[PDB]
Write a structure and sequence with these properties.
This is part of a larger assembly, with chains A, B, C, D and E. By secondary structure, chain B is mostly beta strands. Chain B is 0% helix and 51% strand. Chain B has one domain: 7 Propeller (Methylamine Dehydrogenase, Chain H), CATH 2.130.10. In chain B, the strands form 7 sheets. In chain B, strands 1-28-27-26 form a 4-stranded antiparallel β-sheet, with no helix packed on it. In chain B, strands 2-3-4-5 form a 4-stranded antiparallel β-sheet, with no helix packed on it. The relative contact order of chain B is 0.14. The chains are: A alpha+beta, B mainly beta, C mainly alpha, D mainly beta, E alpha+beta. The structure holds one RNA strand. Chain B: Pfam families: WD40. Chain B: It is found in: Cell membrane; Cytoplasm; Cytoplasm, Perinuclear region; Nucleus.
Chain lengths: 141, 313, 191, 64, 104
RNA sequence: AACGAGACUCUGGCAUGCUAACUAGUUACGCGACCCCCGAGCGGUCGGCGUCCCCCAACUUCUUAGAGGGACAAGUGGCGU
């Protein structure tokens, strides 16, 4: 059948919807290669799952991602989290349980929220000070 | 005499195994439901590396999956879940054929007929209901019904007999007749509320149970109280056997397998000790089901395991 | 092991800890290797949770102070890639072994505290946690390079890499090993 | 003092002391004989099963 | 004739709004006009943040007030007569309604 | 027995379940058009890159807002009369 399963990633408002479709190679993000994406000092980070798992889980898929939201940093964690999760879901659904179970164990060993979403988001400013917890100076006499 | 050896144990769930049922088309598979919102279709081996591995896990329900049952074809599967809805699976990869919308509250029990066109359901809506296999309501039963939740319903052999069993928490067993939908009878005889009921494959018996403490037997052919046995403090599952005339009773710390010809206990299954304080050594057994061979039976427990046993002669 | 991660150039094996009093508070090789020292991290919400994140990550965190370098953790990783590079060329050792030695040689073993008696200052000498030694040792050597590059032609990278050589050796020509012995010199006195 | 540096490990933690709770009393086994044991005052936040590095064992403590 | 007619509803009360939407979807479905369900639009926030003290003195405090309006719209395509029939019936609470001549 | 406390209301973190979407999207081709061999190949054909083209297409993961579900010291081990 038409093999397509979709996932998303999060990190503090930054969605990255990564569809995993059958194929081979040719992983992209935003219609660009992920061999350069432009801070490229955190370049080793989005490459990390691919490098660690080897090329033999990526031996039959094209994964492509669209993004929006967040800053430069938070986008990198979102796209990484999505492609990792994409791979897992694909094997659970069209291959078998024991296929994805190995791969799940590998990622969660060096967990860096590779299968879960960071809960933390910004807290509101309340008056009487800048920020969400700081207070203006208070002078006596 | 015949006795039981501990065969092995399966692992795959993160929650309590609620029910198990068995494909007679393939004794190679076996199916399970659980309180971590998945039904696991297994791939069994008789090996020592494992006794089986989960093949797939069908997902969609937003709450626990209480009970599960096979189709006559064995290529479909049907479910009852604590989300108040049912799903009708196409037992291959997933891909729901139909989802059945009705019932205000949970779907506790569910069953699939021999004719494959009638599907019943027990619900905390206080309704027995009949279901087309197009997923629409052939009939709904809400008059002359239980005033308490309907615990478990069953299809009975339709050799010439149009009867379906119903038991509720109102301390009654109601028998309903197909396409008239009247009370055939009401049976009284359970101090506690009734959990379950099941009919013999031959079709002459109804092994019923509850929190009565006693396991009372009723007659499928006109409704008579055949006899009673002291045992089964809390009764959660019952299952007749095809290769013997036994009845296998699910109590919490133990399973009591009874020969009825004459009435005697064959064995009591006990699990090996584990040192606990104050006391949490038993896990509750909640379900059990025979294989087609009738040599091996499987059990669902609340320690997230499906324990296997085997009869030895 | 057959998928062992470097730093993109450095082994995390062949890294010794020369104390039994500071091993398992150094995190560098149990499975704590990573290609970068950037993570979301959990460094809080439980007391024993700081010691479970890498030493290299801790280093990047602790050198971003003085009110204008906060929120510029990405610039900080630039400084770390040059630091290790210079350390490896300069002496020949794997530059992680340098850092581990530098931490072990700089940690103070006794420190003083205050006690109020008779309305006059009295001091008492006390010992220190292993977790305290690590926290102190990371702070001290970083203070040297931060100070040095504050009006010099020399860049922060050069200063920091120099300071880890003299710390990793017993040379006592550094901002760290100076101040280490100063504290102990007090602790002897009011012992 | 100028005697070889000692190493001794926690057996039990007692409670926090100091004038702001800044110090922590702890009982320690000498880690070269367990029949020898001294109580110490330690600055840092100690836990259980940790090893310390004492520069003497002439001193014996019980509070500050 | 059969005109694509869009019935916009708008209110400040989500309960009072929603049941009146259900009524207008009912009256349409009753006559099988092939109506489209509610398309719930983003709820908008009116904010007013002002001093609690008249004539400044004491600690500086403010107070967030908010009103939340709600918009949602049902698309019909049917004769304009029967529309104005079904529109005017079964409305009791303070809820506004706006009928549109035609839509693309 | 009552008030204050908590309870409550609002807000945030969890749903591939439910409800339904040309003033929200996606996917799928149909594509025709542009583009480069850019990839297998040769420039053809097949694929890639986005836009117009898209539908009386398919869908609602992403966006939206309603009803519900979920968390209880519940489970396990210590400790406490």
């Amino acid at each position: 059948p038409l093999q397509s399963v979709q996932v998303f990633g999060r990190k503090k408002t930054a969605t990255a919807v990564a569809h995993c479709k059958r194929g081979n190679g040719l992983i992209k993000v935003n219609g660009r290669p992920l061999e350069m994406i432009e801070p490229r000092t955190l370049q080793y980070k989005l490459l990390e799952p691919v490098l660690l798992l080897g090329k033999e889980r990526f031996a039959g898929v094209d994964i492509r991602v669209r993004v929006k939201g967040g800053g430069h940093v938070a986008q990198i964690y979102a796209i990484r989290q999505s492609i990792s999760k994409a791979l897992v879901a694909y094997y659970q659904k069209y291959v078998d349980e024991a296929s994805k179970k190995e791969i799940k164990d590998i990622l969660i060993q060096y967990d860096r929220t590779l299968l879960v979403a960071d809960p933390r988001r910004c807290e509101s400013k309340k008056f009487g000070g800048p920020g969400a917890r700081a207070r203006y100076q208070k002078s006596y006499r | 005499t015949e006795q039981m050896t501990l065969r092995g144990t399966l692992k795959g769930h993160n929650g309590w195994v609620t029910q198990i049922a068995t494909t007679p088309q393939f004794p190679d598979m076996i199916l399970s439901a659980s309180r971590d919102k998945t039904i696991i279709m297994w791939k069994l081996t008789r090996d020592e590396t494992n006794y089986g591995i989960p093949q797939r896990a069908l997902r969609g329900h937003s709450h626990f999956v209480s009970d599960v049952v096979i189709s006559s074809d064995g290529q479909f599967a049907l479910s009852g879940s604590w989300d108040g809805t049912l799903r009708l699976w196409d037992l291959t990869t997933g891909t729901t054929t139909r989802r059945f919308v009705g019932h205000t509250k949970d779907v506790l029990s569910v069953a699939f007929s021999s004719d494959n066109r009638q599907i019943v359901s027990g619900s905390r809506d206080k309704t027995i209901k009949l279901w087309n296999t197009l997923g629409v309501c052939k009939y709904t039963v809400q008059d002359e019904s239980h005033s308490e939740w309907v615990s478990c319903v069953r299809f009975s052999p339709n050799s010439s007999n149009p009867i379906i069993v119903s038991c509720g928490w109102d301390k009654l067993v109601k028998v309903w007749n197909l396409a008239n939908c009247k009370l055939k009878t009401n049976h009284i005889g359970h101090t506690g509320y009734l959990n379950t009921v099941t009919v013999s494959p031959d079709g002459s018996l109804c092994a019923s149970g509850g929190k009565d403490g006693q396991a009372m037997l009723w007659d499928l052919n006109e409704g008579k109280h055949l006899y009673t046995l002291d045992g089964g403090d809390i009764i959660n599952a019952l299952c007749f056997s095809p290769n013997r005339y036994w009845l296998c009773a699910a109590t919490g710390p133990s399973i009591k397998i009874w020969d009825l010809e004459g009435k005697i206990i064959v064995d009591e299954l006990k699990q090996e000790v584990i040192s606990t304080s104050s006391k949490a050594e038993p896990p509750q057994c909640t379900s059990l089901a025979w294989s087609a061979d009738g040599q091996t039976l499987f059990a669902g427990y609340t320690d997230n395991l499906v324990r296997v046993w085997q009869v030895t002669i | 092991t057959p998928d062992i991660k470097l730093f993109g150039k450095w082994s995390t094996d062949d890294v010794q800890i020369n104390d039994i009093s500071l091993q398992d508070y150094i995190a560098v090789k149990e499975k704590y290797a990573k290609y970068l020292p950037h993570s979301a991290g959990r460094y809080a919400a439980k007391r024993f949770r700081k010691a479970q994140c890498p030493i290299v990550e801790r280093l990047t965190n602790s050198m971003m102070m003085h009110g204008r370098n906060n929120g510029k953790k990405l610039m900080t990783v630039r400084i770390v890639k040059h630091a290790f590079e210079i350390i490896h060329l300069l002496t020949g050792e794997n530059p992680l072994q340098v850092l581990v030695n530098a931490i072990i040689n700089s940690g103070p073993r006794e420190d003083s505290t205050r006690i109020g008696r008779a309305g006059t200052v009295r001091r008492q000498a006390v010992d220190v946690s292993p977790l305290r030694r690590v926290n102190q040792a990371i702070w001290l050597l970083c203070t040297g390079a931060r100070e040095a590059a504050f009006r010099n032609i020399k860049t922060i990278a050069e200063c920091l890499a120099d300071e880890l050589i003299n710390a990793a050796k017993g040379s006592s020509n550094s901002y760290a090993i100076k101040k280490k012995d100063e504290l102990e010199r007090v602790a002897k006195s009011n012992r | 003092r100028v005697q070889p540096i000692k190493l001794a490990r926690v057996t039990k933690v007692l409670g926090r002391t100091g004038s702001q709770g800044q110090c922590t009393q702890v009982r320690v086994e000498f880690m070269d004989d367990t029949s020898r044991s001294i109580i110490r005052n330690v600055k840092g936040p100690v836990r259980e099963g940790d090893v310390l590095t004492l520069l003497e064992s002439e001193r014996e403590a019980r509070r500050l | 004739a059969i005109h694509r007619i869009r019935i916009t509803l708008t209110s400040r009360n989500v309960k009072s709004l929603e049941k009146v939407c259900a009524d207008l979807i009912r009256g349409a479905k009753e006559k099988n006009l092939k109506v489209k369900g509610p398309v719930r639009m983003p709820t908008k926030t009116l904010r007013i943040t002002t001093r609690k003290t008249p004539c400044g003195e004491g600690s500086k405090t403010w107070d967030r007030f908010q009103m939340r309006i709600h918009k949602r719209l049902i698309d019909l395509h049917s004769p304009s007569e029967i529309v104005k029939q079904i529109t005017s019936i079964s409305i009791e609470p303070g809820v506004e309604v706006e009928v549109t001549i035609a839509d693309a």
